[PDB]
Amino acid sequence: STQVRGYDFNRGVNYRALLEAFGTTGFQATNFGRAVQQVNAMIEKKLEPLSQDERRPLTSCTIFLGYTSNLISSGIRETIRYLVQHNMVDVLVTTAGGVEEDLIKCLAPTYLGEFSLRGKELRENGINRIGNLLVPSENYCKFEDWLMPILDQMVMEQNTEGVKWTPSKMIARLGKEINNPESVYYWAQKNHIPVFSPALTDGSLGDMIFFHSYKNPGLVLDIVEDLRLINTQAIFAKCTGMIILGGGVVKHHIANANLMRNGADYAVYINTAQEFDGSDSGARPDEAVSWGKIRVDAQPVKVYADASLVFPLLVAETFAQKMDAFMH
Amino acid sequence: STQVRGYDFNRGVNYRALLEAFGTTGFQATNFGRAVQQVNAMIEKKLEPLSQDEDQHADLTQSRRPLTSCTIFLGYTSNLISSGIRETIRYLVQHNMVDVLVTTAGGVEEDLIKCLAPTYLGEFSLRGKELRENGINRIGNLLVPSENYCKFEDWLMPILDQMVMEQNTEGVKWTPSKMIARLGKEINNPESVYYWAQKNHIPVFSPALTDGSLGDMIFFHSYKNPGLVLDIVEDLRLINTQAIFAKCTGMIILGGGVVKHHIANANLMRNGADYAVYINTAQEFDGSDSGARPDEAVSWGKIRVDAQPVKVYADASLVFPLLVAETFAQKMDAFM
Amino acid sequence: STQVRGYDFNRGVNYRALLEAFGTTGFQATNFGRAVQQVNAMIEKKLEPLSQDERRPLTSCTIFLGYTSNLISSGIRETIRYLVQHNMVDVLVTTAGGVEEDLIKCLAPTYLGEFSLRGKELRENGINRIGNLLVPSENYCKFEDWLMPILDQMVMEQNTEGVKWTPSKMIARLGKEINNPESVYYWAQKNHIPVFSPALTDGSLGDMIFFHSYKNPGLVLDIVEDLRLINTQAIFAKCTGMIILGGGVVKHHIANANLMRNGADYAVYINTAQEFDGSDSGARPDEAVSWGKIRVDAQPVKVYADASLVFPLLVAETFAQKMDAFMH
Amino acid sequence: STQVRGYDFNRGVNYRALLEAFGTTGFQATNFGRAVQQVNAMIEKKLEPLSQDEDQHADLTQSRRPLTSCTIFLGYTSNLISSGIRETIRYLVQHNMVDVLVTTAGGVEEDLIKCLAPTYLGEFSLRGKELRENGINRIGNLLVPSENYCKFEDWLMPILDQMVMEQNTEGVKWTPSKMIARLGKEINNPESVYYWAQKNHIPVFSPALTDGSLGDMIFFHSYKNPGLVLDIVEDLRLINTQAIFAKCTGMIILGGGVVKHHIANANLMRNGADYAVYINTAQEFDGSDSGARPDEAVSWGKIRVDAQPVKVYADASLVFPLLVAETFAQKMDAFM
Ligand SMILES: NC(=O)c1ccc[n+]([C@@H]2O[C@H](COP(=O)([O-])OP(=O)(O)OC[C@H]3O[C@@H](n4cnc5c(N)ncnc54)[C@H](O)[C@@H]3O)[C@@H](O)[C@H]2O)c1
Ligand SMILES: NC(=O)c1ccc[n+]([C@@H]2O[C@H](COP(=O)([O-])OP(=O)(O)OC[C@H]3O[C@@H](n4cnc5c(N)ncnc54)[C@H](O)[C@@H]3O)[C@@H](O)[C@H]2O)c1
Ligand SMILES: NC(=O)c1ccc[n+]([C@@H]2O[C@H](COP(=O)([O-])OP(=O)(O)OC[C@H]3O[C@@H](n4cnc5c(N)ncnc54)[C@H](O)[C@@H]3O)[C@@H](O)[C@H]2O)c1
Ligand SMILES: NC(=O)c1ccc[n+]([C@@H]2O[C@H](COP(=O)([O-])OP(=O)(O)OC[C@H]3O[C@@H](n4cnc5c(N)ncnc54)[C@H](O)[C@@H]3O)[C@@H](O)[C@H]2O)c1
Structure with a gap:
């Protein structure tokens, strides 16, 4: 049984050792160390070779990464971009803001402010x-100005070339159009990582589709085909892991997909929600076990914290140390 | 300036005086009192008489519901339909006290499932394995x-069959709201929120309607009977036009997520809601939309600068029935 | 097994029935109904007559009421006053602000504002x-102006009459001096309800003692005797119940006292804290069971909510309906 | 104006650059970066040379600790001493990097108990009965x-015996801080926070020192050896004078409760702290002092109007070691 003991700064500032010490520091530092272990287990399983019996290359473990839209407003956008760029995750799920703000950041930056600034001024x-x-x-x-000509082409392709648009197909097209290596969705489409966002109209992209539809009516975004697409990613996996930042639709949509295989093998939640209000956002991993969304034999972990603090540290201790294994 | 003073139980137990005393008790009890005032202001404006032409509003909004002097958007997270707040919401919809509903998929399906079988009380700590x-x-x-x-x-699969048949031979272009209206008509049960919503021409928006059991069923059904399409673009047009052609709007939002943003963003299209009450347990510090204060929405134009919005920081299962008791339920004589 | 069902407003607004329906409404409404049941069980036990074998009159169950200081700033001050006035609880615990602001409210009122008002202006x-x-x-x-002459007398009584002051003895004296039936501590001392506050210097009372000590040095406030006094209230009880609003010192001090009898028989927590940070404030009742602060056979309840909303409703459904049993 | 940009792992893993990037990442990562800046400002002011007379300051504050150019108050809730943050705090006290400690009783006793036996890792969900x-x-x-x-x-009872004997025959008037100094000397172990605090003349205030196991033991001891008195009035004088006769003050407060108010109220006596960093998980909506934002303290005069205080909303077990790594631990050469 493991003793509580924090990092001793009389050793100097040995950053790797400082991060490794979170495991024995307690409360959410300990849950962070557990999350490092769960993600490294996901990665080790993914890098194992496939058996006989066992367009994106299939691997030995399919990793679903979900994040709320605001995390793309944040600099975690860079963290996510890196993982997608290097094919370290296999499926993305985000709400609509998490799509559009990635693209907008390629046209103009977001700036730092304060929570207390008054809305009137x-x-x-x-x-x-x-x-x-x-x-x-x-x-x-x-x-x-950037998006409207693309909406024009999508409608034309719908009506003259038989294209049946869905959120994931639109997101791949927008990533191809942005044509910019700073963009998450540019790398996602380049690497054949699908992106699911069933309420894609809830944001500025929706605003633009709405206005566009009055000059160029008839664009259809079907969410049914996208439900088949995400569920089949789980159903035909050898192994799945879920890394979920924040709650809402993203968290449920990934977990519900994995119910279709009787549960994810690995799961890490990082979110600030709490269970007491009955919310799905705040549901603990063990709630998901009751439904079959996480396997009974899994050892899932929740870190109760703002992901803008934790997620870059998690990546530093897991994916980033196995970068070589993910290249060329 | 108003003094802090709690209810005095030496008066005995008068529950109305007790709830009214929330206003001067402080902290979230005070915000509850402010929320009562904001909702009663919405209702008061809604009940003012109107004079507008019936044909052009139906053409612009593509809806059969008559305009009133204030359009009230009610949003709630799915879990509140798991709770007994389902009965609170059903009452409001049954009596045409609100004009637009927004909920996530669970908030649709579990209202229907409760007409078939009940949900039970348990504990948060029950272990998932067992x-x-x-x-x-x-x-x-x-x-x-x-x-x-x-x-x-068993209840839903024959309905999905009919929907596909109507799409492919009767030209129907399904969206979430249109599906939700049809499910409410089929459930044909006065305990159901969506039975009353469709009967009273109250639209229900749920852009991620696939995220739940209804999605499971659509998924399974599609391998037996392929082809159902659910378009979210036309539903965006429908919700936004409800705000654009409103004379006045109020937002009552329980919880956060999709529901809260979708209602507020629709109201941006008219340069902001006139009244707004949030009841939710989220906090701002994580940058979340759920946790954003009303004054964040003011910066975008989702809430008018001249409005007096209120947030109550609390579990809506505690607060919403009390709020309805002090507002809509006192005005039911006017609502008939 | 009990079905989820909310209050049906087609019945009209029947307030008692609306409150009774919280029990089957779910999430924290259900925990509120459970808390009503736990407090009513405390009360029913308290009103049972004492056996043979089994200056405040001892009853069949000793109820500890704890609250954070801010709740006395709020109008819950009136709620607490009522319970103390009618001898419905037996021991009070509060931090220093919870003593002084009760007294100050007898001299001048507190006013409503907003959380966002800026401190500079x-x-x-x-x-x-x-x-x-x-x-x-x-x-x-x-x-x-009110307090300084009292500090003068307490020092004189200490130095010429052998008085050994403690927080609880000072609080009883201040309640006698305020001589005002709106004051919690006036009724507490009148009804021989002790008030514990071991960090009584942490607030305006401390400010005043601090300034006073430079003109009239030597006042001593001993916390050791007050530890014996609160612990013996638990040790020699037939039965104990804990009703704890908020966390911090108040919550631990009551629970730790009841460890000395191997645990409270009944317990209701109403607080906004969460467990994830390892705080005592946020510890669930079941954590206290591991220490022996709550008996294993107890059925404790936590309501996760601002007590300014919940506590007056709780009192309405419990103590206030048994008022007759507590009088004359 | 500063652009939002996260750390780019195409650079590899440079942990210092990664922590520095917090500042431009947003939400609480940005507040962490601001907290690093505020603490480094405190340290920078502390290290400025001073010229003040050694005898009058010891007479006014009744303390042997020399004045520096900025007095830093460090507060933490008890549970952080249960955690490994105990090692973080011990490092700061060992090297005389902070000047006053405030913690609740558990934060005293569990530092001592850890020198006798360890604390172990478990899970929040373990059931109390078993x-x-x-x-x-x-x-x-x-x-x-x-x-x-x-x-x-077994360790403490003979010490309590000596304390009573010293009180009754050598005129000692015990207070929490004086007891905490004596316990640190007795534990005589370089892993102990309070061993280092007393050796470096860093006072520790804990006005409710009876609320925990030390209280249990004092209680039991008193029925074998009656008479120990612990006065909180003299300790109020001692903490307040540390603020009053400071040239500059900074507050670093982990958690809320007694600790947070006691430090801030001491600083009111000088019309406010010059620097302040809060790290805690509390929220304002419940009216709590724990959850009060720094700007509430400004209204009272606890924080100067010209200060730039920062709150990081987070579990300090995650954030405090990183904060120390980027501040005090970089300056240890100056601190010797
Ligand atoms: N919860 C269910 O019963 C259920 C059922 C099926 C599917 N789902 C799916 O889960 C997904 C996520 O749900 P969501 O984003 O609509 O909500 P959620 O449950 O994730 O809640 C979002 C936020 O709303 C607030 N909130 C939740 N419950 C509250 C309460 N009782 N009082 C006040 N505030 C409260 C909280 O801040 C919470 O973090 C949806 O897509 C939904 O279809 C949930
Ligand atoms: N930038 C934006 O936030 C933005 C922009 C445009 C549209 N929107 C729309 O807002 C709607 C709702 O958003 P949502 O449900 O996706 O998320 P949300 O922001 O409401 O967050 C949901 C929950 O996730 C958790 N969470 C949020 N941020 C977190 C963080 N930094 N760390 C840890 N946990 C965190 C919290 O518990 C929160 O209650 C969407 O449909 C989205 O498209 C948002
Ligand atoms: N917790 C223990 O190990 C322990 C041991 C013995 C006695 N006690 C007693 O419990 C009483 C109450 O403790 P308290 O008021 O000092 O603190 P607490 O644990 O009640 O915390 C008060 C508040 O501080 C903040 N906080 C707590 N942990 C935090 C963290 N990890 N990161 C950030 N913020 C955090 C939270 O908002 C919390 O509500 C004290 O009198 C103490 O002596 C506790
Ligand atoms: N008015 C004041 O708040 C005030 C005035 C003077 C002095 N002080 C001093 O502040 C110090 C710390 O206060 P504390 O520990 O007593 O309490 P606190 O205000 O810090 O609260 C502690 C915890 O209790 C819970 N809580 C607080 N308010 C609540 C509410 N309305 N509903 C539910 N839960 C709630 C929260 O989890 C909070 O973190 C004291 O020693 C006190 O004397 C406070």
């Missing part, structure tokens, strides 16, 4: 607040 | 037997 | 913020 | 065998 200057971040309205003007 | 081994699914401190979903399957 | 006008409440600085001036 | 039946006590996801407290009893 912000609105008067055309500045929109996302937590302690700030997005000028002009950013969305630029998005409009 | 529950799974007995076919019991946990929702917070509630429990749903798996057999409930089997009954749901 | 408040400080410039001599207005102090407590959450969404406001206390003018003048309130504390009035407190100073 | 733990109680095996003499294991739960602290969050940590576990303390009851035997740890038996060892504590």
Whole structure:
């Protein structure tokens, strides 16, 4: 049985050892160390070779990465981009803001602010607040100018070439169009990583589709085909892992997909929600076990924390140390 | 300036005076009192008489529901339909007290499943392994037997068959709201929220309607009877036009997530809601939309700068029935 | 097994029935109904007559009421006053602010404000913020004028009459001095309900003792005797119940006292804390069971909510309906 | 204006660059970066040379500790001493990097008990009944065998005997801080926070020192050896004078409760702290002092209006070691 003991700074600042010490520090530091172990187990399983019996290359473990939209507003956008760039995860799930703001960041930046800035004076200057971040309205003007010709082409392809659009197919197209290596969705489509977002209309992309539909009516986004697509990613996996940042639709959609295989083998939740309100967001991993979304023999972990603090540290201690195994 | 003073139980127990005293008790009790005031302001504006032409509003919004002097959007996370708040919401919809509903997929399907089989009380700490081994699914401190979903399957599959047939031969272009209206008509049960919503021409928006058991069933059904399409674009047009052609709007939002953003973003299209009450347990510090204060929404234009929005930081299962008791339920004589 | 079902407003607004329906509404409404049941069980046990074998009158169950200081800033001060006035609880525990602000409210009121008011402009006008409440600085001036002559007498009594002051003895004296039926501590001392507050110096009372000690040095407040006094309240009880609003010292001090009898028989927590940070505040009742602070056979309840919303409703459904049993 | 940008792992893993990138990552990562800046400002001011007279400051504050150019108050809730943050705090005290400690009683006693027996890792969900039946006590996801407290009893009772004897025949008037200094000297172990605090003349305030196991032991001891008195009034004088006669003050407060208010209220006596960092998981909505934002303290005069205080909303077991790594631990050459 393992003793509580924190990092001793009389050793100097040995960063790897400082991070390794979270495991024996207690409370959420210990859960962070457990999450490192769960993700490294996902990775080790993924890198094992496939048996006989056992367009994206299939691996020995399929990793679903989910994140709420605000994390793409944050600099965790870079963290996610890196993982997608190097084919370290296999399926992305995010809400609509998490798609559009990645693209918009290729046209204009987001800025630091404070949570307490007052909306009246912000609105008067055309500045929109996302937590302690700030997005000028002009950013969305630029998005409009960029996106509208693409909506024109998608409608034409729908009506003259038989294309049946879904959120994931639109997201791949937008990633191809943005054509920018800073963009998560550019790498996702380049690497054949599907992106699911069933409420893709809930955001600025929706605004633009809405306005567009009055000059160029008839665009259809079907969510049924995308439900088949995400569920089959789980059903035909040798192994699955879930890494879920935040809650809401993203968290349920990944977990429910994995119910179709009688549960994920590995699971890490990082979120700030709590169970007491009965929310899905705040449900503990053990709630998911009752449904079959996480296997009974799994050892899932939740870290109760803002992912903007934890996720880059998690990546540093897991994926980033196995980078070579993921290249060329 | 208003003094802090709690209810004095030397008066005995008058529950109305007790709830009214929330306003001067402080902290979230005070915000509850402010929320009562904001909702009563919405209702008061809604009940003012109107004079507008019936044909152009139906053409612009593509809806059969008459305009009133204030359009009220009610949103709730799915789990509140698992709870007994389902009865609270059903009452409001039954009496045409709100005008637009927004909920995630679970908030649709579990209202229907409750007409087939009940949900039970449990505890948050019940272990998943033993529950799974007995076919019991946990929702917070509630429990749903798996057999409930089997009954749901049997009820729903013939309806999905008809929907595909209507799509392919009668030109129907399904969306979530149109499906939700049809499911409410089929369930044909006065305990159901969506039975009343469709009967009263109250639309229900749920853009991620595949994220739950209804999705499971659509998925399974599609391998027996392929082809169903659910378009979210037309439903975006429908919700936004409800805000655009409103004379006045109020937002009452229980919980966060999709529901909260979808209602607020629709109201951006009219440069902001006139009244807004949030009841949710989220906090701002994580940058989340769920946890964003009303004043964040003001920066975007989702809430008018001149509005007096209120957030109550609390579990809505505690607060929403009390809020309805002090607002809509006092005005039911006007609502008929 | 009990079905989920909310109050049906087609019945009209039947307030008692609306409150009774919280039990079957789920999430924290259900925990509220459970708390009503636990408190009513405390009360029923307290009102049972004492056996042969089995200055405050001893009853069949000793109820400890704890609350954080801010709840006395709130209007829950009236709720607590009522219970103390009618001898419905037996021991009070609160932090220092929870003593002084009760007294100050007899000299000048507290006002409603908002959480977002900015401290600079408040400080410039001599207005102090407590959450969404406001206390003018003048309130504390009035407190100073009222309190200083009492500190003079306590020192004199210490040095010439052998008095050994403790927090609970000072609180009883201050309640006698305030001589005002709106005050919690007036009723507490009148009804021989002891009040424990081991960090009594942490607040305005401390400020005043601090300043006083420079003109009239030597006042001693011993916390050891007060530890014996609260622990013996638990040790020699036939039965104990704990009703704890908020966390911190108050929650631990009551629970630790009841460890000395191998645990409380009944327990209700109402607080907004969560367990994930390892805090005592956020510890669930079942953590206390591991120490022996709550008996293994007890059925404790936590309601996760702001007590300013819940506690008056709890009192309405429990103590207030048994008022007759507590009088004359 | 500063752009949002996360650390780019195409650079490889440079942990310093990774922590520095917190500042531009947003949400609480940004507040962490601001907290690093505030603490480094405190340290920088502390290390400025001073010229003040040694005798009058010792007379006014009744302390042997020399004044520096900034007095840093470090507060932490008890559970952080249960955690491995105990080692973080011990390092700071060992090297005289902070000037005043404030903690609740558990934060005193468990530092001493850890020199006698360890605390172990467990899980939050372990059931109390089975733990109680095996003499294991739960602290969050940590576990303390009851035997740890038996060892504590045996170590402490002879010390309590000496304290009573010194009170009754050598005129000693015990207070919490004076007791804590004596316990640190007796534990005589370089792993102990309070061993280092007393050796370096860093006072420790804990006005409710009876609320925990030390209280249990004082209680039991008093029926064998009556008479110990612990006065909190003189300790109020001692902490307040540390603020009053400071040239500059900074507050670093982990958690809420007594600790947070006691430090901030001491700093009111000088019309406010110059620097302040809160790290805690509390929220404002419940009116709590724990959850009060720094700007509430500004309204009282506890934080100067010209200061730039920062709160990081997070479990300090995650954040405090990183904060120390980026601040105090980089400056240890100056601190010798
Ligand atoms: N919860 C269910 O019963 C259920 C059923 C089937 C599917 N799902 C799916 O789960 C997904 C996520 O659900 P969601 O985003 O709609 O909500 P959620 O349950 O994830 O809640 C989002 C946030 O809303 C707030 N909230 C939740 N419950 C609250 C309460 N009782 N009082 C106040 N505030 C509260 C909280 O801040 C919470 O983090 C949806 O797509 C849904 O279809 C859930
Ligand atoms: N930037 C934005 O936030 C943004 C922009 C456009 C649209 N939207 C829309 O808002 C709607 C709702 O968003 P949602 O459900 O995706 O997420 P959300 O922001 O509401 O968050 C849901 C829950 O996830 C958790 N969470 C959030 N941020 C976290 C963090 N940093 N660390 C840990 N946990 C965290 C919290 O418990 C929160 O209650 C969407 O449909 C989305 O498209 C958001
Ligand atoms: N916790 C223990 O191990 C322990 C041991 C013996 C006695 N006690 C007694 O319990 C009483 C109450 O403890 P308290 O008021 O000092 O603290 P607490 O544990 O009650 O915490 C108070 C608040 O501080 C904040 N906090 C706690 N842990 C945090 C963390 N890890 N990171 C950030 N913020 C955090 C939270 O908002 C919390 O509600 C004290 O009198 C103490 O002596 C506790
Ligand atoms: N008005 C004041 O708050 C005030 C005034 C003077 C002094 N002080 C001092 O502040 C110090 C710390 O206060 P504390 O530990 O007593 O309490 P606190 O206010 O810090 O609260 C401790 C915890 O109790 C819970 N809590 C608080 N308010 C709640 C509510 N309304 N509903 C439910 N739960 C709630 C929260 O989890 C909170 O973290 C004291 O020693 C006190 O004397 C406070």
